[PDB]
Design a protein around this ligand. Sequence first.
Ligand SMILES: Nc1ncnc2c1ncn2[C@@H]1O[C@H](COP(=O)(O)OP(=O)(O)O)[C@@H](O)[C@H]1O
Ligand SMILES: Nc1ncnc2c1ncn2[C@@H]1O[C@H](COP(=O)(O)OP(=O)(O)O)[C@@H](O)[C@H]1O
Ligand SMILES: [Mg+2]
Ligand SMILES: [Mg+2]
Lengths: 230, 453, 450
Amino acid sequence: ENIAAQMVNFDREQMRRIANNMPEQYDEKPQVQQVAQIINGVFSQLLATFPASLANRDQNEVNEIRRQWVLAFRENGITTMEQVNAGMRVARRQNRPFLPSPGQFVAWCREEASVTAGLPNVSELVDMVYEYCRKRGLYPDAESYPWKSNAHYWLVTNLYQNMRANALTDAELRRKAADELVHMTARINRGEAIPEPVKQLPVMGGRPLNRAQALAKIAEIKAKFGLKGA
Amino acid sequence: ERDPQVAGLKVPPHSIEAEQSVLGGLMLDNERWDDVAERVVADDFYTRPHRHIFTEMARLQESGSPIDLITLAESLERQGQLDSVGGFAYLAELSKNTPSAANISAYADIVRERAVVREMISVANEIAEAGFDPQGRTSEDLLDLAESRVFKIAESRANKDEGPKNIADVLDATVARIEQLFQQPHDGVTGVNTGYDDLNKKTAGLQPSDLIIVAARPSMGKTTFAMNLVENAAMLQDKPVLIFSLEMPSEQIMMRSLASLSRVDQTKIRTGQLDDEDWARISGTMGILLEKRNIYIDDSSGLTPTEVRSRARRIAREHGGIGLIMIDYLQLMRVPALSDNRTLEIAEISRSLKALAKELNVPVVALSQLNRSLEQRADKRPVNSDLRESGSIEQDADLIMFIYRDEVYHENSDLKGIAEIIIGKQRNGPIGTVRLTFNGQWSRFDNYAGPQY
Amino acid sequence: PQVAGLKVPPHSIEAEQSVLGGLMLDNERWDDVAERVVADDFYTRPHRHIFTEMARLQESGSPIDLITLAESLERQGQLDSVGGFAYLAELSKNTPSAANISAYADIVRERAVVREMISVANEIAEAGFDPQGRTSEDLLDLAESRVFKIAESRANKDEGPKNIADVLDATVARIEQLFQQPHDGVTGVNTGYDDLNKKTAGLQPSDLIIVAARPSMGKTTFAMNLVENAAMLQDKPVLIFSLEMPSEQIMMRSLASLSRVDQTKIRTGQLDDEDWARISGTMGILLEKRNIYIDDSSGLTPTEVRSRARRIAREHGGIGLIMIDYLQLMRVPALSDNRTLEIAEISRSLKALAKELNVPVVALSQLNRSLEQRADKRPVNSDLRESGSIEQDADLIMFIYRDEVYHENSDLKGIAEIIIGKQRNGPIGTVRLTFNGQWSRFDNYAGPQY
Ligand SMILES: Nc1ncnc2c1ncn2[C@@H]1O[C@H](COP(=O)(O)OP(=O)(O)O)[C@@H](O)[C@H]1O
Ligand SMILES: Nc1ncnc2c1ncn2[C@@H]1O[C@H](COP(=O)(O)OP(=O)(O)O)[C@@H](O)[C@H]1O
Ligand SMILES: [Mg+2]
Ligand SMILES: [Mg+2]
């Protein structure tokens, strides 16, 4: 479109577009210094936990490992120190002398955060999904399933629908379960109220009719409407 | 008859349905004509009425008249050729039975292919028939005749990729270019002027048919600098300037342009806290723009290179050329076929942009994003390798400029308010850093009046 | 045989019988017949067999009279297949000695040419009727290639297996031609550089040549210098396909290189009197020669490039060199989905074009970013990533390396290295040149050599 039309509209409206005005607020981002300090603290605490990990290694390998950890944390979004503390607790629970991979540490942090929010971990969620996939054909609807809590219902139904629609494999199912757990934990930590399904209609019933009365009704209908063929 | 298929293979290959679809699409849509014109010719049509219709439509298109059903029928009626074609009844049948909402490119290609195959078969038949009946011709004459007949098939193109040219024509064109450049003293600006002295010194303006990439980290004035260049090009040149905005709407761009041109604080305009002087400045700017009226903006999202090229061609046809093209930004452009691989999509986008720039003989400035790892380096001034996932962008770009502000990363920067344009790849000149002054309050770039080292 | 509209392949049995009988009766005129007709020109198997046996006997130093020919045929068991001593005696007797075998040999001539032309037309029609997955462009390219090959020196049929006699004649002709023109170690197109000529003996015809380097190393400069040297040192046309730059910028670079004038002055038009004189001399020489053609179309398919090269060779009777800059910008629409297949098709088509036109084809290519992360940044073959078929199909591969590009404090400023990564018919190594970017030129390195 030509600028002339917009300018003519601006001249015709003037104060109307001033009422429209322009959205405010800009973009603010954290500095690299905070991320560097977080990475240094994580590295120091891990070296304290696993002193033998960097034994017999030059500074170049240490710098490369630090760069890899920085990249992994930036990709996975490690900002709060509470996640770092949870990961350190999980690592102190772990019994492997060697230094864990950054992805494993991120998984530990996410798993501990999910467990803190009163939700099952990835393995329990996957087992529940498998049990649901085996047993849900025996119930009239998803709301008739014996659900423990609303979070279980939503997680299981969402994972089942996603898996059936996208033909997910086992590893893809586990990754989706981890993502769903992260999202549900984030929602729970933000307060929020989990809805109580939707339900679908009552069952009705109450049909106390026998064979003889039904035959009498059919005969009466035939007599009234003159259905000679029947 | 008495022929299911025994006499059905004397018929040369053809497709009536594709011809009718193309003619109907042209009748019910006159915007796609060029797409039809670049794929089919009047001699690709098997039936005389279709050739006549296509020729008349081409004549009307060249004369500027619309090529709808009514106008075409009237034009044929005046020349007395309506009866020969098949009548207004046949014209209406073609217009109606053939849908408007169709892809005419496929039918045009189908029409093109059958004509080539049929002409090749006919030429082979003629060659064999001449061979069996020499009629006094020698072997050399027959071979020359066969060669001419065979190569006359791929020939007969109206005007499309004229091909190799003798050194004489290219030398004449180069002499004409040199004379035209010298006849206009612009103090070393042999191209689209940018309005900045040092930038014009280092780059000699924005040369036509070049791919120009502007790259910067978020919050660096990349969009502001691009808009300043667009405004300078529009003010200093009379050719139209086209803008593609895949991120911000056109209204915000217009408000930013008004603020930059009138040097009115953006906060007051965004809050509506203006006064009489601001109104006078805005009115003067709008009067100047109405005097020019050489800027066009398209704010569609997810634009493919084909749509961009088509719209640029349409604008050039409507207003006799383009002065500059601006795209913000290239990463938002989508290639449906290469959506699976990002690198191939980026390479296709860069190649299409370079091809468009070369075709239109206009400078095309596309905006790009850098990698976040740049922020982790000791020096945050961008380099070419900071264009990761876009090696083809570095390869195919004539000019690459990085916008840098040390004030963004350093609060106590000694160069506060000073921005650097770093020339990563200057194809036809030297490389270096050009210093400018950045006014984010007015959202503008100005010449650096301070001392230069 | 009224011959009032009959469609019969052109042939004359009487001429063949007369030629064979005359050669039987007088073996001395064999040379006068050997320059006018070949075995393949004969229409029947017995006549071809007889002519081949006579040629073998004559080039083995033996008479080709009736008795000797029959005895030689009998020893190989092929006398019965020919037709027998009865048919040989009939050939010897029926044809009179007092004959002019030159006219008959010229008759067993071009009739075969017309028959070959009819065969080519039939092949074109048959290919048109049954595409077998071929597009229209492929069919047109095939037809053009066939009709172009048939109309060049007419040595034999369009294409097919050839007896080793014809190939040996061609090889001896090639040796004699390469020895008739002393170029001091250059048997192909001269590159204008002595060390490169020593390494490669010129740009050989029918070879695929790849020039590769990282961006800003000077691929276009080196290629244009090769084009200019080929044009100045030869008479055949030189064709340029520039999908990356307009022809005007290329011409400005060429003027800067040839006239040795600063490129910035030419681009900005600010020249002194001596610069104008040099430019005038260069333009005069270029307009005197007139054998450089430039095509700056973008997104060319291999079919279009081959067709345009074929048209140029058809118009001017041959090509001296073809240059493409560069191959990563070419398009194969049917294979747009897969890049590897597209690159393989481009490389194969370029090699086929080089073989067909008997011309050197130099195509430019780009390398991968990972090269910049190695300890030594000099290119290797594996740096042709996505283009393994390029490494497999290229007759010659040259990489351009300037150390000053990566090292500002490099001690080798102005010195470029041409590294031969692959040479099918020669050695490999590094050739040093002087890079004058001011004039956009490469020159012979005058420094000391180890
Ligand atoms: N009204 C304003 N007042 C002061 N500074 C501004 C204003 N608007 C934009 N800026 C500055 O301009 C810079 C670039 O903004 P913008 O052009 O939107 O982003 P980009 O750098 O991606 O082009 C920002 O860093 C911001 O500080
Ligand atoms: N006016 C000039 N003066 C000196 N050197 C130049 C000039 N213009 C270009 N160059 C040099 O040419 C080189 C690249 O040329 P070119 O061959 O076009 O690059 P590519 O290798 O991508 O083809 C650059 O390294 C640059 O140093
Ligand atoms: Mg922006
Ligand atoms: Mg180049």
